[PDB]
Write a protein that binds this DNA or RNA. Structure first.
Ligand SMILES: O=c1ccn([C@H]2C[C@H](O)[C@@H](COP(=O)(O)NP(=O)(O)OP(=O)(O)O)O2)c(=O)[nH]1
Ligand SMILES: [Cl-]
Ligand SMILES: [Cl-]
Ligand SMILES: [Cl-]
Ligand SMILES: [Cl-]
Ligand SMILES: [Mg+2]
Ligand SMILES: [Mg+2]
Ligand code: NA
Ligand code: NA
Length: 326
DNA sequence: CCGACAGCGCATCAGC
DNA sequence: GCTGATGCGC
DNA sequence: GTCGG
């Protein structure tokens, strides 16, 4: 946290561009800058110093000098005072309400938690669940609870079929002391890149979890991706645990490594790694790594027997999950 | 300068 | 109904 | 907003 003030500033700017300006590239520019500065092992003393880092240009350098000299940024000061911006930024905090819907609601005069609650009939299913658990979704998940959550999911999945393999990825797998949610990667021998010998593979698991009352709500659900809400059981006379966001992503078993790589992140790490891959002549997704032809068209999937193999293809030294938190 | 910026699942919609 | 675009999120 | 060619 040597540069917490600067990274917070850039993150706020990133959120402004994404949520209010709807300028996704500026949003990513700011996040990339915050990221590289977040790992820079020195307390930054000037914008010039910061500008030496990749992702930090002239504009950000200037902002860093202003922040260093005054402890704040006029641009953000004004943004915070702008009611429209503030309202739109707030609404996007509800799961399911993005930049477009927030601006629409604000036009309709809906700009507060109270307003949303009085207009629940104007929200789609996802948004409705997001509003319902607004508070809870704001709370972090102590790793201690993530461990209890992992135990339940793995045991319940085992009960459905001993051949399933559930792996908790995301921030949990990177060793984080607390997580925003639980990301579960799921595989079964019946579902491979070559065939699906068993339908409802994901359904059966979600069903078992609801039956035991672990999964309490559903945000979205397809044949390979489920996103919903879950809750740990509490004891007698004990206050209940906050509801938590959970996702179960079913991936073809023979494509496990590309899958766990993708699901372990971080998101910015994946962006950087996939970008590097392109420069090296490859393309990486959660299923495979393919070479790029002289035309740019992805070729056939290359053999993969470990996460490290993927790193080898792009000439990157292997990085443990804990060191991928960019 | 200037095009590129990672890659994709599910929900909802318009047009047919 | 379908396909394709778009919103939203991982 | 940043940057490689
Ligand atoms: O833009 C994205 C978002 C997520 N992901 C991948 C990497 C990330 O680690 C994983 C899980 O997504 P989350 O949004 O759950 N983030 P993470 O688990 O890293 O952190 P936390 O949940 O604690 O915020 O999905 C991407 O590749 N791109
Ligand atoms: Cl943009
Ligand atoms: Cl500020
Ligand atoms: Cl693929
Ligand atoms: Cl690790
Ligand atoms: Mg997560
Ligand atoms: Mg997640
Ligand atoms: Na730079
Ligand atoms: Na949102």
């Amino acid at each position: 946290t040597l540069n917490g003030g600067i990274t917070d500033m850039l993150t706020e700017l990133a959120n402004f561009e994404k949520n209010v300006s709807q300028a996704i590239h500026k949003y990513n520019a700011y996040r990339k800058a915050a990221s590289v500065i977040a790992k820079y092992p020195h307390k930054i003393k000037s914008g010039a110093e910061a500008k030496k880092l990749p992702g930090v240009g002239t504009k950000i350098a200037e902002k860093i000098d202003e922040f260093l000299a005054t402890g704040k940024l006029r641009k953000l000061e004004k943004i915070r005072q702008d009611d429209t911006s503030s309202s739109i930024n707030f609404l996007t905090r509800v799961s399911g309400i993005g930049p477009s819907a927030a601006r629409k609601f604000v036009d309709e005069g809906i700009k507060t938690l109270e307003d949303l609650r009085k207009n629940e009939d104007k929200l789609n299913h996802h948004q409705r669940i997001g509003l319902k658990y607004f508070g809870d979704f704001e709370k972090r998940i102590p790793r201690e609870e993530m461990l209890q959550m992992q135990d339940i999911v793995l045991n319940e999945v085992k009960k459905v079929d001993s051949e399933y393999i559930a792996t908790v990825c995301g921030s949990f797998r990177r060793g984080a002391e607390s997580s925003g949610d639980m990301d579960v990667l799921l595989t079964h021998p019946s579902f491979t890149s070559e065939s699906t010998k068993q339908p409802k593979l994901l359904h059966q698991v979600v069903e078992q979890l609801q039956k035991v009352h672990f999964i309490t709500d559903t945000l979205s659900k397809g044949e390979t991706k489920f996103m919903g809400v879950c809750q740990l059981p509490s004891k007698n006379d004990e206050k209940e645990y906050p509801h938590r966001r959970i996702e179960i992503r079913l991936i073809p078993k023979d494509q496990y490594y590309c899958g766990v790589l993708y699901f372990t992140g971080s998101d910015i790490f994946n962006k950087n790694m996939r970008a590097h891959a392109l420069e090296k002549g490859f393309t990486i997704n959660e299923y495979t790594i393919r070479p790029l032809g002289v035309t740019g068209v992805a070729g056939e999937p290359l053999p993969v027997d470990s996460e490290k193999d993927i790193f080898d293809y792009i000439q990157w030294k292997y990085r443990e999950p804990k060191d991928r938190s960019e």
